[PDB]
Amino acid sequence: MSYNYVVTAQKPTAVNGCVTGHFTSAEDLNLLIAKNTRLEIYVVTAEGLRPVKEVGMYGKIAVMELFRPKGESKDLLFILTAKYNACILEYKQSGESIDIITRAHGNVQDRIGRPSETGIIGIIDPECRMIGLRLYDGLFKVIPLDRDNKELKAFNIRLEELHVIDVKFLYGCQAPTICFVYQDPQGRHVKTYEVSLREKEFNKGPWKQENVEAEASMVIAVPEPFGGAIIIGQESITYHNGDKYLAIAPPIIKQSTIVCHNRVDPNGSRYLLGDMEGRLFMLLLEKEEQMDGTVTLKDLRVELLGETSIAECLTYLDNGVVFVGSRLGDSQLVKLNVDSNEQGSYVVAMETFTNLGPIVDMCVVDLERQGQGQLVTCSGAFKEGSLRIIRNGIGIHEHASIDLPGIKGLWPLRSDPNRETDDTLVLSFVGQTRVLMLNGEEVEETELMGFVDDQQTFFCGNVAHQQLIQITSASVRLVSQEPKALVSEWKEPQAKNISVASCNSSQVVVAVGRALYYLQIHPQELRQISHTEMEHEVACLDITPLGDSNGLSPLCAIGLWTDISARILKLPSFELLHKEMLGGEIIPRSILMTTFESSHYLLCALGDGALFYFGLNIETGLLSDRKKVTLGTQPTVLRTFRSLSTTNVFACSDRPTVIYSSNHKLVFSNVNLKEVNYMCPLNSDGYPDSLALANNSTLTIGTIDEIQKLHIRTVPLYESPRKICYQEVSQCFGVLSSRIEVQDTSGGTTALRPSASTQALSSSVSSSKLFSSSTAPHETSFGEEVEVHNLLIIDQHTFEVLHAHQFLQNEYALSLVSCKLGKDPNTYFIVGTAMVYPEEAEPKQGRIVVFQYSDGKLQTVAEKEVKGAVYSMVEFNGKLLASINSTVRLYEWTTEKELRTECNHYNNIMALYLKTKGDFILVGDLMRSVLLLAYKPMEGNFEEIARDFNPNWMSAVEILDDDNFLGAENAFNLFVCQKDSAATTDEERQHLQEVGLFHLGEFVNVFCHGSLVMQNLPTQGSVLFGTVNGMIGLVTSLSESWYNLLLDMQNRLNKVIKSVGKIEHSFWRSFHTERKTEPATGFIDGDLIESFLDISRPKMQEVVANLQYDDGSGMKREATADDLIKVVEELTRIH
Template sequence: QINEKALCYIEGLGTGIQNSNTPITADDNLLTSQFLKEIRDKTGQVEEYTAFVRGSIHDIDAEINRLQTLIKITQEAKTRPMLNKCEVQPEHVHRAKERFQVMKNELHGLIHSLFPNCDSLIIETMGQLMAEHLNEESNGYIPVTAETFQIIELLKDMKIVTVNPYNKLELWYEFALRSTRSKRGRVQRSDWPALMNQPIRAPNAISLNVKQTLIMTYINITSVKLFVKVQNIFGVCKVFACLIVIGGGIYEICQGNTEHLNKGFEGSTFSPGGIALALYSGLWAYDGWNSVTVVTEEIINPGVNVPLSISIAVPLITALYVFMNVAYMTVLSYADMTSVPAVAVAFGARVLGPASFLIPLGVAIATFGCAMSVQFGVTRVCYTAARGGHMLEVFSYVNVKRLTPAPAVAFQAILTTVFITVGNIKTLIEFASWFLWFFYGLAMVALLVLRKTQATKPRPYRVPTIVPCFVLVVAIFLSVLPIVHDPSLKYLMAVGFIVMGATVYTVFVYYKKTPTAILRKFTFLTQVLFESVPPSDRNFTSPTDLNLLVAKVSRLEMYLVTPEGLRPMKEVGLYGRVAKMKMFRPPYENKDLVFILTARYNAMILEWRTTASGELEVVTRAHGNVSDRIGKPSENGILAVIDPQARVIGLRLYDGLFKIIPLDKDSTELKAASLRLDELNVYDVEFLHGCSNPTIILIHQDLNGRHIKTHEINLREKEFMKIPWKQDNVETEASILIPVPSPLGGAIVIGQESIVYHDGQSYVAVAPPQIKLTPINCYCRVDGRGLRYLLGDIAGRLFMLLLELQEKMDGTQAVKDLKVELLGDIPIPECMTYLDNGVVFIGSRLGDSALVRLSASRDEASQYVQPMESFTSLAPIVDMCVVDLERQGQNQLITCSGAFKMGSLRIIRNGIGIQEQASIDLPGIKGMWALTLAENSTYHDTLVLAFVGQTRVLTLNGEEVEETEIKGFVADRQTFFTGNVCHNQLIQVTDEGIRLIGRSPSGWKLSAEWVVSGARGLSVVACGPATVVAAAGPRVYLVAIQDGALELKAEVCMEEEVACLDLGPGGDEALLGVGLWTDISVRVLKLPDLRPLHTEKLSGEIIPRSLLICVLEGVCYLLCALGDGSMFYFTVDQETGVLTNKKKVTLGTQPTVLRSFRSLSTTNIFACSDRPTVIFSSNHKLVFSNVNLKEVTHMCSLNAQAYPDSLALATDSTVTIGTIDEIQKLHIRTVPLGETPRRIAYQEASQVRH
């Protein structure tokens, strides 16, 4: 049985060598002593078989050497004709056959002599060994086909080759792509004997690549941030794999393995066609520069970052690839490198040993990352082409949740799947490379033409003209010579693709001969499937940013629309009152510009740009004054409109005149031309869509009523050409025109009782009863097709206007009906803007503006409108008064604001706000401190509260608070101070003395205690990381904190009793401030010997109650708060202790406690009193800001996991945990009235406002 199998294998091997395109090389047949040792270890219990294997090593090695010689001869016969373009020489083939026949006979005899009686043993042992190899290294998948089953036979019966990652990867790569009926099978070790004689199909490479494409598609659809994260990880892995190869090469060079380096260019050819074909693969490896350029819109400051990224990445990748090839040639010969399909894997198999799996893993990671980045780039090309009208519009739609071009990504995934079915990676690379370089050449031709015809056109970045010329020459070289050198079907297919694409573009895009009904259904299904909508046309800061621009009198506020809401970006002041603001996008721009007209007729075009430092700046592209010396300003106000194709700006400033400003991309001055208008009393004007020349439509009134009329403008002659159409006698209260985008065209006329759609040939009119109550005063368009509009009236109601379409006989669409539905109540709108995903910004001048969301179903109040965010506005203010409501000396402003249903009283107070997060009812608190008990934690987890005669400990467990105990803590006495100190210990100070609590394996325990002597107990304490200063009567004690011990370092007796004290920064040589009772003074002492440095008398008879030494902005201050709410503060010389620059400020009326805390990495001071105040330094001056709390008695910093960067504040009855505002600001409280307030007066005795 064995002999027959061996004979079949050898005969098949001969046929494979003669017919296969990829000859079997010596690397495919590895027989090593290591493999035979593994066989001996696996079968040590079989003495007969072990003896046989050991005795046969020498004979098998000799036969393998002969087989390798045969393979080299066969390779020579097969590879030489391909290099020299000549036929196979018959003598070579004959010589190979003769040598092979001799080898076959010798092997057959050897096998016959060595394996006469051990068939079953060999089958069982080798079967188990093969199954183990395959299960361990390929998770049980057998990567072979019928063609490779002969090699498996050799593994089982002849034991000539072993299975390692390189062999398996090569076999899978070679045969999986060539298999036409591949089938994945999973073979366990126990199944191997039954499957020995059955060929196992290879995994389907096409299926695997399709799955990889789906993974990449999911990542690119999900989030740009997810793509960036994955790409960064894969990029690092790719570089790491390259460095592994380079490191291995350096090691081999150090070992002296350089024999192959001198033969690296042997057999080279300088055929131009061959060089072009070789460049396809090389340039494919460096094609990342193209992916960078196609995502220019999403790059910050592309003029700097695109060239910078290319100039850094290309040399870096070049260096990596060159050094990798040098590393390959330290191990592999020229013949080896040209015969194996995966050079890096062969290198890893020989150099890295057990770690060789890192190479194929790195190759797979690098390939996946590269493919994903290419997909990211080409989808943006598809998205931009669709947005510019060169592809189906639906491919320019964006997912409403993830803000990614999901339809374009899915479309590219489908195209990728089609290309995968080719199956031959080499043919695919050559096909795609020729295709790409052909279009690179066309792009360079277009670029050179545009350089000539549109030299001044703004561009994201510009390169010297020599660069596109050079690229054009290279593109011609790479496109023409390969066809001349090797004409083949793939180039014909590429030309067919180009012809097909040109045909589709010409018919369906250029001439717009699209099946409307089918396209509409396809668009609808795509939108539903990918939750996508047309891209917004409010991209000011970048082509991908969705922005909201709000004009407030003379200021512009720029917001970025994010999934979390509106994020402020920039606020700009203007020298004038904004009368009109319009957004437009010229065809030569990739983002929007803003036209602004002030009340004094100053016009400007603004652009938002990002500087090299990342800052956002406003640039004036053009400006000018459009006023006339004569003319009657219109009583109906200023009207400003912009042509949909951004050809001209239209202004109605004076009765009987219509001004036009042609939009020239090179002009920096706005010059207006006046056109005589027969219609004097104009109520509204707009530009119509889809007109070859700019055409306006207007509503005007004469003695016979109101009418609509259109005028076509000749920009060359700057005059009206003709009247395309008009409609007399529309509703007498019609006042608003809404232009409808193409292909419908026409306009909607909004009146007080009716709504009419008119396109010049037909019209549709409705009289919905919902709008008859109050007139409509503003509108906004919802979708890009112009089928849905939002209408707002002066009563604060929101309506949806829907254009219902029908298909005509010629396949076009027309408006069939108009539907109006009441959505709900909103603030009284002055303007409205639909942002995205059902979110609308409502701008109001009679109250607060708002951000609302439109829901698909009614809420409990039968409304479709859900408020999201409110933007406070005090306007209009009719009356106001200043009062002290809480009688704390903090005046507040009360205004009569708003009008109609948005009328309200606004109570305005200046200060810093505390955002409450939690509160606990605990009266009588005398002190409060935060501790960290968990080991190796940076968060506070415990809150210690001191009361008269007792101490309570609270554990912060998330947002829950529980009372607990700390071993070693005294709970039945009042704590004057506690905190974390050096050596991971706690300190507690009571009237009895100082207790040091240390950590033990069983928990906390009392480590040391220092008890004060005498009858007077401790009453005032200050503590540093390793020092405690406490006072009992007039005596001051300095105690050092050591590891498990307390040591009294110094003691001093003051002239009077100590009222307050505090330690300054400086460690062992810090300053100590001491406030005394009777003489009302402040003393400065020096540690560690408590040496007096300075005495400062305080004026008055009020004793000091709290003292604090801290450093703010590099200046050391001493602050001393008195019992009447006033405070002295000084600057301190930290060397001499001298106090200078004495100043006094009144903070409140009650005794004040001073505590320091950190906010935004800066030190601040909190003054606890009946008028809480935050003290901070700004430009080396102390600033005092009121806190919007009624009273605070104690404060401590709290940085818990559930309450990070917070403050714990105690009042007479509660403990509040909250965060503090970053800056001082106005705090406004609203009292809704539901009607317009007129006058306000305040009666102080009863605290009643009238």
């Protein structure tokens, strides 16, 4: 009954290849970015790469390409999913309305046989007769790219080259030929053939198999006039055409492995090649000329263009720019010049894009102390390896700032009666004021005749009848805009200094301690109308007009001292209408009568960091349905502003959140800003739509965008990371990472490049000799490489490496735990290591090493020998629980500061993962899925409780409950198993029975509980996970009623939410393993649930047709297009 809800918390980023051509129009230059199951369509212009349309398909994409099947003006897009569902797609733009029209679709899988080890490879004939694919062993599938082949009928050609490396359609031949690199008894060769779908045969043949570099893997088809193909290996490139070939072996490619290529020059003369180290190369084909006019190749040259991010895919776009896509790092657009720069490079970066993966590890720590935890992750690979910090703040867009400290208030004034915009900004300070004249974006200090700058100001602003007003501790000054000079002044009858004041259009309200006055504003007069006196001092005043009143509030908001209370009086006479108690020893600082959305509320901020909110009945002065929330530590000044349409308020505090109305409730979220003590809305000529947010140090002007909420800081390591943990003692993160050294002619390996682990403020190396006598690595092999692992001390605020501790050569750091152990109060970083060699399929030796993060040094505390490699470690009841090969071993930390083994368990194949909860241990395996162990302290040993009988290869695991284990496998599936405690026999009781099964299409690498939300107080829990594509998902538990509610909802939603290519949702959702395929069950596709809001109303009504959902009372309630939105919102606000 372990039902779960699954959503994407962060959209996938990994550039799973790319496609370029003329998709959006015949003339446009297009680029499509592959994101697993999604595609983002862009057009490139002089200004950069701009988005066109975001689309999705129900399935992971294996093949994507553009073609023009003789007669089309636009390219058509062919897509084949990992489930073998093919389609032909046409881009359609009905003015502003953009979508994709499916012209053909159908499955192209072979029912009996076994798939190619190369995966699904699909290529298109340049003459566009057919698409050819290498799908099965010895099986090449060809599908006519016709207009009438709606079902995509496929034909099967038997291939002699059973095992191939890379197939591409060839140029320089009228026939639909393919040139490819393949493996046979003669080594690797390049060969060609003519595909024939009607004959189901391969005809010959541009050329015969010819010898290529043993490491050859890539084939480039070369456009006419050259024709032919280019073969690329590790150290050399060859060009083949008929019975002749050219060859070159540049040292610049020899040093790295080329991953991908892309044609630049349409005559087939120039190609871009790129590696995984970040080098981009230009391959130039130097042509000759024959007596018959034939174009042939004379030679091959490769130039190093410069450095880029990892070249997973290259798509040359325009008149110089190429997109460098990476699923192993960040992506970018670089221009290829002719004239070299000061570095000798021809690569000029234009734009860059961030990729939040592959995700290696994750941890969540609140480094801001806002209630919003930030996720610090290990991501990327090679030179693109980095740490990233993802924080959930609705981004602020800052336009200006000024260094004017000691501010105690700020108000924009319209000093020119004939202008709409603000002319000046008035600032109040501890014991003075300033007035800044606004000149577009620039400002200057000015002086107004009616303005005071040698007194503290409580309030300043515009009032009715073209007037300015200022209230100081000394007096109330009414100023006319025309002269910008005083016309009337009011003075306290009690001869006391003003302690509270506020102004509005038709009047002001002031107080001196207890005494309270109502003064009306006339064209040139301040007229006292009425006054009273409070039992206790006034803490705050607000008489902002409510409803449609002519600048006059019928109500007066009063905060009070001593008793700690706020009340509503009828302003004209100060008659009590309503009162509320606020607290004990805490005084209110800000009381408002204002609006959210279109409704009226009363607010009250107290000097304990908490706020009150009340519904406000403006006609009667009554409050109802009050709320209390905690924002920060400061009394907070609450201020009203208008947003994109309706109004909201902002918390001017140490925790600068914005408060808005949602589901008939006032809710809030933190803004990505340091601190605010005072706020006012700004509408000037330079800043026509912004807020001026000021604190006691500086003033900043900007907008709360409410567009971006998740902000990512990237901190490059230039080395692949491995693990991350946090220690509260050193106020730092512990990070494991791996840098690469390579072998040259003498002395073994040496650093290939600089990285964070060597570019440290401090460093050290392990001195352990424990496995000295047993370490005999291949340090005498030219071109070979070694991983060098380090434990880093990372500053929690700066994320610089404060210390880098290197492990022994060929010592891997596989696991990291942050905890205190045994009776030792100190929190330590525990690193699980292993001795790993090229000859050892399985490790025999490793160790558990405990370190202390002390300032700029990493101090070794303990070094425990283990038998096998320590692959995983977790905290377990004050003890260190570690997985060493197949054996799970529990270690006790003694007062001697060293580990000793208490007990173990090894009834498994390999103990791939560890997670703990109390005395329960979840062990992941390679072919046993999830196993459950428990510690039995009464025996001092382990007991096997249950196992999943299904031999799943786990990619990651997590514990959902004592009898419930959630995890994901290498088959790109998610599942949850439950121990059958209700069972009758042991076969059943000891079985962790699959309850739910769901396919993600994503390979989950990391699990951790928690989410990037701001904590201010349908589904329960929050298991977060990261995948190899930068995707971050979130899984929460469901009740029986909500599972069925959402289950019926999914069935309706998939009827109208059409995929690209008309590919059924039943394909992607189905749990797909090596042994069985099953439809999703026990899980909700929460992305489908959210997607409801992205369809037109008529289709929303189709979804809710006959849509009655079971409820906890047992009632079934029908739904309407608007009510099923409410359902989405109920889930949205939780996950």
